[PDB]
Structures are given as C-alpha cells and as structure tokens.
Amino acid sequence: SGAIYVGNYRVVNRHLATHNDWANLVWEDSSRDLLVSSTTAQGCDTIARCDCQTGVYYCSSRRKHYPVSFSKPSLIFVEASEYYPARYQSHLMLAVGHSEPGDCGGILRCQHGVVGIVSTGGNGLVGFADVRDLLWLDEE
Numbered sequence: 001s002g003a004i005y006v007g008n009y010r011v012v013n014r015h016l017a018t019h020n021d022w023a024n025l026v027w028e029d030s031s032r033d034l035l036v037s038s039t040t041a042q043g044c045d046t047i048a049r050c051d052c053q054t055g056v057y058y059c060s061s062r063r064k065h066y067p068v069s070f071s072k073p074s075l076i077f078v079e080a081s082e083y084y085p086a087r088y089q090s091h092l093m094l095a096v097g098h099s100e101p102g103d104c105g106g107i108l109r110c111q112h113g114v115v116g117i118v119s120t121g122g123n124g125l126v127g128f129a130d131v132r133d134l135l136w137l138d139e140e
C-alpha cells in the first residue's frame with residue numbers, strides 16, 4: 001500500500017483505490033494503474049519535474065529503502081496479475097530490485113521529489129508508475 005499527497009490531491013494505484021477515492025475521483029487511467037482523488041486537507045509531498053534516472057524507493061516486503069537506476073517511462077507488456085489481465089502498461093519505469101504485490105504504493109523519489117509509485121513486478125524487476133508528467137497536480 002501507499003499514496004502521494006500533493007495539494008488537495010491523493011494519488012494511489014488504481015487497483016487499490018477505495019470507494020471514497022472513486023466517489024471523489026479527479027482522474028484515472030487503467031493503462032497506467034493510476035487514480036487521483038480530491039482531499040479536504042492539504043498534502044505535503046512535492047512532485048519531481050525532471051528526467052532523473054536514479055533515486056530511492058521504499059520496499060515494504062524488506063522494510064528497506066533501496067537506491068536504484070531506472071528506465072525512462074515506456075509502454076511495456078505486463079503479465080496477468082490478480083488485478084489486471086495481461087496487457088501493455090504505459091508510463092512505466094523499471095529497475096533491478098525486489099518487489100512483491102503488496103509493495104504497490106511504495107514511493108520512488110529523486111533529489112527533486114516524488115517520481116512515481118510501485119505498480120508492477122516480475123523477472124527480478126520492479127516497475128513504477130510515473131507521475132512527473134501530471135503537471136496539473138502542482139496547481140488548480
């Protein structure tokens with residue numbers, strides 16, 4: 001699990017969104033595994049606006065924060081899971097590292113702020129849904 005809180009927005013994995021998140025929906029994209037909902041309280045996170053390829057992510061199945069190199073966001077084939085059939089997932093960044101399904105929501109960050117959240121895994125690679133192109137998260 002995990003979320004990003006920026007301004008009056010909550011960013012979560014689409015597959016883990018709650019009924020309140022759907023009732024207060026702002027934007028969602030199934031092909032990205034992302035959902036943003038509105039909040040009453042202001043958040044404290046900053047979204048990175050950069051093209052960094054190194055940062056650190058939180059891995060709950062290890063209780064550890066790992067420094068990693070990751071690929072730029074791309075369209076990649078992802079095998080079927082408990083939440084989606086096999087399909088192409090867009091805006092997905094990959095790194096060599098450990099992850100398990102319950103690690104989804106773990107934040108990847110660079111020196112500029114939040115890069116994305118854990119979304120996929122397999123083949124010894126952890127995939128992260130990019131949020132740096134969602135410029136509207138910084139305003140209203």
Ligand SMILES: Cn1nc(C(=O)NCCc2cocn2)c2ccccc2c1=O
Binds near residue numbers: 081122
């Ligand atoms: C972070 N992580 N997640 C998943 C997963 O089930 N993601 C659900 C969301 C999803 C996106 O595209 C397909 N399913 C997974 C699946 C098998 C093996 C490892 C992992 C893993 O490390």
Ligand SMILES: [Zn+2]
Binds near residue numbers: 049052113
């Ligand atoms: Zn950066």
